[PDB]
């Protein structure tokens, strides 16, 4: 219902969206464009990394999980710098920067 109506943005529907990708997909189907019970890409993209930074998404020591969160929200610079710090994934982060360049 609230995937069709883009409502109840605060309720993460955790009963059915238990994975991270299920959350991203749940919200990107809820973002809106031009006051209550409404979320926009700017709020969502900022809300995610500002409040729930790397710390929240890298506790499982899985780096790509956070990268996908930033890249699939149009925050390409964040995801590039972030992934560029993983000494094992420097190569990959430089190139995804070149492509964007």
């Amino acid at each position: 219902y609230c995937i069709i109506g883009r409502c109840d943005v605060t309720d993460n529907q955790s009963e059915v969206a238990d994975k991270t990708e299920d959350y991203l997909w749940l919200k990107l189907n809820q973002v809106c464009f031009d006051p209550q019970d409404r979320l926009t890409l700017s709020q969502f993209q900022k809300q995610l990394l500002e409040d729930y930074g790397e710390s929240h998404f890298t506790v499982n020591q899985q780096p790509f999980l956070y990268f996908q969160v930033l890249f699939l929200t149009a925050q390409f610079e964040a995801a590039v710098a972030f992934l560029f710090r993983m000494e094992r994934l420097r190569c990959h982060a430089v190139h995804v920067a070149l492509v964007l360049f």
């Binding site: 955790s14 991270t20 959350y23 929240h56 506790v59 899985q62």
Partner: peptide, 8 residues
């Protein structure tokens, strides 16, 4: 309260 469990 988003989960941190990656789709595996």
């Amino acid at each position: 309260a988003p989960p941190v469990r990656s789709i595996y």
